[PDB]
Structure 1
Amino acid sequence: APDIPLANVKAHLTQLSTIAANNGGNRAHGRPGYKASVDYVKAKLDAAGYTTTLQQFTSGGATGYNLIANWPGGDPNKVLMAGAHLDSVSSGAGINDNGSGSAAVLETALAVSRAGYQPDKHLRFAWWGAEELGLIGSKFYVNNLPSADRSKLAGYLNFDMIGSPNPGYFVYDDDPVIEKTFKNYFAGLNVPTEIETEGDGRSDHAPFKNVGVPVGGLFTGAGYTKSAAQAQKWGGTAGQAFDRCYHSSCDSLSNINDTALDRNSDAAAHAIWTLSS
């Protein structure tokens, strides 16, 4: 797998920050900042050769969208999916929650095209809308997939908050194969990892997990406090939240730790290449 360039990931975050600033200060469901985010991501994917689909749904009286991108080729009966929610809360730009996961998945999708990669399994990427209203977009996608198509899903990888400013390195403890793939990557960098407990079933992997699709993912921490033991293994500040700007107006471009964002973006590409062989 390729090394994902941190500068390219940060460039997507800068574009999402500008879109929020030009649209009222946020990228929330039912507000212009969300559709403008979808448009930026879709344009990059269409230029790289992906087949893109906009799935529309209505929640809380407003139209939301999911963006689904399929890389042509691969085994249609074994699909590997990776995704991230693209909406923010209305209090701010949502750069770490979840511009960080959205940008890492977008750059990995662009890396597949730049590399001319032809995977054995078919690759599909998704950006979910309305996750902040209760996983509405990912629930809509799973509820609308016929059972014949659900059985073709080999796994779903989720990236939701992967650039926290005072980070931890947490790996989901769901499917064992996906979990091991991420743990082995971090072992090679000599970065320890811990099992994800803070989020639980509170992100877009839940609807997939509930219907039997193997799931996994990465997380760097939100409102919980980093312990002394955690600061010893990862650096940062003990006694302070992993993300002091969670759901706040200060979740902006300065609310990102570059080392964590780079390591998690690289880990995402490593898992996507490894599991699609």
Structure 2
Amino acid sequence: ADHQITKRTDAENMYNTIQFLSQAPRVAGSPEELKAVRYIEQQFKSYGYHVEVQPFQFEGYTAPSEVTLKIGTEKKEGEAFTYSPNSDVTAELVYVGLGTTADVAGKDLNGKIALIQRGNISFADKVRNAAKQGAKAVIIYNNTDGKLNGTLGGSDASFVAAVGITKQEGDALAANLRAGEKITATVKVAGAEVKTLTSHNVIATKKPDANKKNTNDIIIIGSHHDSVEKAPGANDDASGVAVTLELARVMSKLKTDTELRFITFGAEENGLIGSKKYAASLSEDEIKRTIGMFQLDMVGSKDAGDLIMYTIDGKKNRVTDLGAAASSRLSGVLPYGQEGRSDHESFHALGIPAALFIHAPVEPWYHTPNDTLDKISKEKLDNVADIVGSAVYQAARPGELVIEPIDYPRRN
């Protein structure tokens, strides 16, 4: 049965999809993402699919024009967290540890600037916990090398300007403060803006067309069509979109007894907003009938490692079972592990079996201007299309679903 898939997986088609999409970054809610939505819609239609476009709004963030951080007189390097309010305050710097509700409860942060170490809780809670105590600004320092780049999740007037700094420059201040030194700091954040944007999810569905063998099962195959600022997003995630489109094309040539929904989600980089919106559109019946959701994210880089399947809880499910089965016949052992960070999380949250298919360890180009077309491997795109497509087909082909017993290891 795999031959029905492997003989039709066109790597040139997939390469071409990535070439068109990665001509420029596709920031969620931007004209470029809209352009991608129209392109994807048109390709699905060309395969003969009926397509639906689900719109949704979300709070976008415009980075501040300038982030000025100063300890007394010396100027330090700091990057304002996304969704960070604006500020122009100069006051005493107070170390409050991890910024837990307790760490700040015993301290006097009224009108002062809090110094918080990254860890345990989310950056959002730290800023929130410190702001509730009267803190006018927050300085968070790294746990590892390199700048501290994070997000407060989304807009929230309960926040106060928050900027991150390295571990070295952070442990130093914390030490000086612990030693009893009285330090003053300046946190000026200007330019930052929050705006309401509109993104979209593209949904192409193939209804079962088998004889009396039709089931009421549903399988979802997804990827996200947006990319981060400044990143052409060839592999993250035009690659996933390319495989999603090609598999949709492949399946249109075959009879199926299982409803297939090929979807490209918007605003994934903003917090899986698109997939959360689509998941919220499903009825209780659709939820219980969805036997599996396959997420394709970063599946074409020549500079990434072997293919692996990630599940939210690190446990095996119907999707990893099918993925493992297909791979055992086509390429060998396909390991599984625990990881979220992608659209599969949105379906796992509803109890639907789900897994992320990705090449790990990931390439160094991830989220950089270097995530381009010349890093893409047609051979890997084709292999993923072969494995995921055969796994889906093992279920979608006419007849009853049978999954033979096979062992596949968990990899951390």
TM-score normalised by the chain length of structure 1: 0.84
Name the structure 1 match of 2:381: 261
Query: Aligned pair 1:95/2:234, yes or no?
Result: yes
Distance (whole Å) between structure 1 residues aligned to residue 233 and residue 247 of structure 2: 20
> Whose helix proportion is higher, 1 or 2?
1
1:194 partner amino acid? P
1:178 counterpart residue number: 319
* Secondary structure of 2:376 counterpart: coil
Question: Residue 78 of structure 1: CA displacement?
Answer: 1.5
Q: Which residue of 1 aligns with 2:225?
A: 86
Aligned length: 248
1:167 maps to a residue whose letter is G
Instruction: Show the counterpart of 2:263.
Output: 126
Q: Which structure 1 segments of 5+ residues have no match?
A: 21-25, 225-241
Identify which of 362, 370, 375 aligns with 1:250.
370
Alpha-carbon distance in structure 1 between the residues aligned to 2:343 and 2:56? 16
Asked whether 1:5 is paired with 2:143, we answer: no
Residue 252 of structure 1 aligns with an amino acid whose one-letter code is T
- Which protein has the larger Cα radius of gyration, Structure 1 or Structure 2? 2
2:244 pairs, out of 105, 118, 123, with 105
Q: What TM-score results when the alignment is normalised by the length of structure 2?
A: 0.57
- Say if 2:291 and 2:318, in contact at 8 Å, map to a contact too: no
Distance in 2, Cα, partners of 1:11 & 1:51: 22
Alignment partners' CA distance in 2, 1:72 and 1:144: 18
Distance 2:290 2:317 in 1: 16
Deviations 1:71-120 (A, max 9, x none): 1335573111111111101122111000111100100101122x2x1211
Alpha-carbon distance in structure 2 between the residues aligned to 1:77 and 1:190: 31
SS at match of 2:56: strand
Between the aligned residues of both structures, percent identity stands at 29
The change in CA–CA distance for 1:76 and 1:128 in structure 2 (over 3 A counts) is: farther
CA contact (8 A) 1:56 1:65 kept: yes
Q: Which moved more, 1:212-221 or 1:29-38?
A: 212-221
Higher relative contact order, structure no. (Cα contacts within 8 Å, ≥ 6 residues apart): 1
Shift of 1:44: 1.2
**Where is the strand percentage greater, Structure 1 or Structure 2?**
2
Q: Which amino acid aligns with 2:203?
A: I
Q: 1:275 to 1:30 in 2, by over 3 A?
A: same
C-alpha separation in 2, matches of 1:271 and 1:193: 12
Deviates more, 1:31-40 or 1:257-266: 257-266
Going from structure 1 to structure 2, the CA distance change for 1:166 and 1:141 (only over 3 Å counts) comes to: closer
Structure 1 CA distance, aligned partners of 2:262 and 2:228?
Answer: 22
Deviation at 1:262, TM superposition (A): 1.8
> Over aligned residues, Cα RMSD in angstroms?
1.8
Report the alpha carbon displacement of residue 270 of structure 1 after superposing the two structures with TM: 0.7
Please tell me whether the aligned partners of residues 158 and 205 of structure 1 are also in contact (alpha carbons under 8 angstroms).
yes
Question: Counterparts of 2:47 and 2:380 in 1: how far apart (Å)?
Answer: 27
